């Protein structure tokens, strides 16, 4: 079909999250057995394999940013991906990892479409800059570097010279905000970006929020749509192995409605799993639901709804 | 500024509910830092200490009421501190203890405004009378002394001759009932009170739900309003260390936005924290997440949204 | 300055606990998390859990579950580690130092720099 | 469980050259640990924190080098001062294993 053509980029980096065991992010995800959940479906999964991640030795900082050189060639690299397979028709799932590598999932995809709309599930907004960060790390600045309105206050970062702005500060929607810094708030206020954080979640609810975000992204004009999912925008009695988990979040529901609205528009063209850390589940059993919650919200993303589906084929025989 | 001005009140009492350990009620969510997470957003916090409650060694019982006199002199000990603390032009944040506090939590409220509301967030109507109780506690019956149309049909119990009722049936608001005896849900329906149990809570959604309750005691006159909170109003799965839990509440997400919707009217005027129990979790994690919940009410009471929160001065140099 | 103050050196047959405060000074507490460690003499030293000052998180060692409860006090800052069915083999110095937080608003940190000066702990009857 | 190898047990270096020592991970830690100076009857005082860049208060003299599996320190001025029972420790890996020993004697 159009959609469901999957091609898989894995992606083995955790230099931008301080919690490693990330690397092992892909590796959880493909021994849970992605691939063949796609396969009962009609889903043309080709693997193009997890991506040979170089380990730069000279990695000096930034001034509050650590490990600038290794997240800047990952998302090079990653953007050459998903830009190879983006020209070959299919759908770019990368699954990592961590949002460092956002910049490059996105970078690459809109390589090949110039007019993409972000949908960015996390509890985080992920837009502090290098300079108005506290963190220093940079699972929290992907989104920084992708509006086109924040070019002159981004600093040239090492490894970040090749990054293009992409998209505009009303392409990119947010569902799951709950834990935003001040410098966050800050920027997201005076961008004016269309976000549904848990109180307007709450307040709508999950239907109510996912028809205005279509609406916002997709009732102008058809385009493509990134969900750039991550796992910690679901609550974490659901994804507890998740590097910086939030309480109250989306639930297990929410997150697969998300998924489901995105599916049926037929325009989701690009996904991100990012964040899964297979070593921070206190039990072997909270991995398994982590990852099990991943592979489900993959799965509805390309066409398990949860009414079923069938072949187009006579089952009355 | 005007509002998130705090004073807090501490108030160890634990003689109007059996299980015994809420005395470490202030003491846990002040050494969880209720404090210094009030004071990163601009919020006056001024600690006026933990109450010293007297111990009256001749405590008879009433007919079914046991220890009335220890509930009548702590209740009119707090309802002076209160009154002391709303002279000051702050917030009374009460914690406590248990809702056998409410009394003096809201009579000396009402000492300096007689025309206030109340929200009160519990998982029961706490409006018992003493003698259309079962269960012969008193963190059951707060409600009606303070009613004004119960006057007549409340002896004259030992403690309670200073209990002048402050608040009419038409200005109190509950969030949350579910277990309500067959004696409160008759005076529920008698005075016909403006509740929202549970049947509303997810009929209508708790956008809707919050709307109707600010619509119901601002959309006449404005006036302050008294968020009676109490933990056994959340579900036990967030807040397990309660003194009565009763399955199948308000979630953390829910309970988040009731408290974000009372300070974004910006006339909240008192707040109690009510029924935190620290040795009723069957581990201490189980008490790390009820009180962590309760510090993340009363933040989100005092400004904290989660949409985040910045100061109003540049952070982009 | 940045410091960790512990107190004190104490002995416990095999019976109750082995609370030991830990307190944080000169840097912003609920900004970092502090973690333990122990050390038998003349031995390595075994990690034994760390807590977060950001909102309590346990997140403690193998072989000891169970055994160690670690929670804050951030009013003052200090933060404690109990022990429960002592034994004979936990004859250590318990140091306690500074992980970070692994939340959001925590600054990058790794490495244990306040360290807490150790405390003599021998569990004997 | 990473187990953390150190593979000088002992060490007798006298006042003068390098003293290079080692920390064998048994995976990938990949530039995420550091080393100590546990003096006897002392606090371990931090040496390197994450495998260079020489920790706040460092004298002149502690670069170290490593990326990614068996990680060196080098001790170039070695100032005699720094006889104590260094100790190297991973912590990008859950339970936060140290290093064994690596008991840098004197020599006469």
């Known amino acids: 079909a159009k959609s469901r053509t999957i091609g898989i980029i894995g992606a083995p980096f955790s230099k931008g999250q301080p919690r490693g065991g990330v690397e092992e992010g892909p590796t959880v995800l493909r021994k849970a057995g992605l691939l063949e959940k796609l396969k009962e479906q009609e889903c043309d999964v080709k693997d193009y394999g997890d991506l040979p991640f170089a380990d730069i030795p000279n990695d000096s900082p930034f001034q509050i940013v650590k490990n600038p050189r290794s997240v800047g060639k990952a998302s090079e690299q990653l953007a050459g991906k998903v830009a190879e397979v983006k020209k070959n028709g299919r759908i770019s799932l990368v699954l990592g990892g961590d949002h460092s590598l956002a910049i490059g999932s996105i970078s690459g995809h809109a390589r090949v479409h110039p007019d993409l709309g972000v949908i960015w599930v996390d509890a985080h907004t992920d837009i502090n800059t290098p300079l108005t960060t506290t963190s220093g790390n940079l699972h929290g600045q992907p989104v920084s570097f992708l509006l086109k309105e924040l070019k002159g206050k981004i600093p040239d970062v090492p490894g970040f010279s090749w990054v293009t702005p992409c998209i505009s500060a009303k392409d990119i929607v947010y569902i799951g905000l709950r834990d935003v810094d001040p410098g966050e708030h800050y920027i997201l206020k005076t961008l004016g970006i269309k976000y549904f954080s848990m109180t307007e979640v709450d307040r709508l609810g999950i239907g109510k929020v996912m028809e205005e975000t279509l609406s916002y992204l997709l009732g102008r004009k058809k385009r493509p749509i990134h969900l750039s999912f991550d796992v910690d925008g679901l609550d974490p009695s659901f994804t507890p192995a998740t590097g910086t988990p939030v309480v109250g979040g989306l639930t297990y529901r929410e997150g697969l409605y998300i998924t489901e609205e995105i599916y049926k528009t037929g325009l989701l063209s690009g996904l991100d799993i990012m964040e899964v850390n297979p070593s921070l589940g206190k039990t072997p059993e909270e991995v398994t639901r982590t990852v099990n919650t991943a592979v489900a919200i993959t799965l509805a993303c390309f066409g398990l709804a949860r009414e079923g589906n069938h072949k187009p084929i006579d089952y009355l025989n | 500024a005007k509002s998130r001005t705090i004073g807090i009140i501490g108030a160890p009492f634990s003689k109007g509910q059996p299980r015994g350990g809420v005395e470490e009620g202030p003491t846990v969510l002040r050494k969880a830092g209720l404090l210094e997470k009030l004071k990163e957003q601009e919020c006056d916090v001024k600690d006026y200490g933990d109450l010293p409650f007297a111990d009256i060694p001749n405590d008879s019982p009433f007919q079914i009421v046991k220890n009335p006199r220890s509930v009548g002199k702590a209740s009119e000990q707090l309802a002076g501190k209160v009154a002391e603390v709303k002279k000051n032009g702050r917030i009374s944040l009460v914690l406590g203890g248990d809702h056998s506090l409410a009394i003096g939590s809201i009579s000396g409220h009402a000492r300096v405004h007689p025309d206030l509301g109340v929200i009160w967030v519990d998982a029961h109507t706490d409006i018992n009378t003493p003698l259309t109780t079962t269960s012969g506690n008193l963190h059951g019956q707060p409600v009606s002394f303070l009613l004004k149309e119960l006057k007549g049909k409340i002896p004259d119990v030992p403690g309670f001759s200073w209990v002048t009722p402050c608040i009419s049936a038409k200005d109190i608001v509950y969030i949350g009932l579910r277990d309500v005896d067959p004696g409160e849900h008759y005076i529920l329906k008698t005075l016909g009170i403006k509740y929202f149990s549970m049947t509303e809570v997810d009929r209508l959604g708790i956008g809707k739900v919050m709307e109707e309750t600010l619509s119901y005691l601002l959309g006449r006159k404005k006036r302050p309003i008294h968020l009676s909170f109490d933990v056994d109003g959340l579900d036990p799965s967030f807040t397990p260390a309660t003194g009565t839990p009763v399955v199948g509440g308000l979630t953390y997400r829910e309970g988040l936005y009731i408290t974000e919707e009372i300070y974004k009217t910006g006339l909240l005027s008192g707040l109690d924290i009510m029924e935190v129990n620290p040795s009723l979790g069957k581990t201490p994690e189980e008490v790390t997440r009820t009180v962590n919940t309760a510090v993340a009410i009363t933040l989100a009471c005092f400004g904290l949204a989660r949409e985040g929160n910045h100061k109003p001065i540049d952070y982009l140099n | 300055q940045v410091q960790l103050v512990q107190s004190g050196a104490e002995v416990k047959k095999p019976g109750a606990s082995v609370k030991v405060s830990c307190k944080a000074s000169?840097?912003?507490?609920?900004?970092?998390?502090i973690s333990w460690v122990r050390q038998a003499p003349g031995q390595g030293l075994e990690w034994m859990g760390w807590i977060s000052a950001y909102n309590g998180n346990t997140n403690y060692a193998q072989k000891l579950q169970g055994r160690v409860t670690m929670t804050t006090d951030t009013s003052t800052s200090t933060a404690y580690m109990e022990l429960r069915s002592l034994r004979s083999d936990d004859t250590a110095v318990y140091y306690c130092?500074?992980?970070?937080?692994?939340?959001?608003?925590?600054?990058?940190?790794?490495?244990?720099?306040?360290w807490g000066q150790g405390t003599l702990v021998t569990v004997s009857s | 469980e990473i187990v953390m190898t150190q593979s000088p047990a002992t060490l007798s270096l006298s006042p003068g050259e390098r003293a290079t020592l080692s920390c064998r991970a048994s995976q990938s830690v990949s530039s995420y640990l550091a080393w100590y100076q546990q003096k006897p009857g002392q606090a371990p005082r931090l040496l390197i924190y994450?495998?260079?860049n020489r920790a706040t208060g460092i004298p002149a003299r502690f670069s170290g080098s490593g990326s990614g599996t068996d990680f060196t320190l080098t001790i170039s001025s070695l100032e005699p001062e720094d006889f104590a029972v260094y100790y190297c420790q991973q912590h990008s890996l859950l339970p936060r294993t140290f290093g064994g020993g690596t008991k840098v004697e004197i020599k006469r």
């Open positions: 130092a500074r992980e970070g937080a692994y939340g959001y608003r925590s600054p990058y940190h790794n490495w244990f720099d306040p």
């Open positions: 000169g840097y912003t507490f609920t900004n970092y998390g």
């Open positions: 994450d495998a260079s």
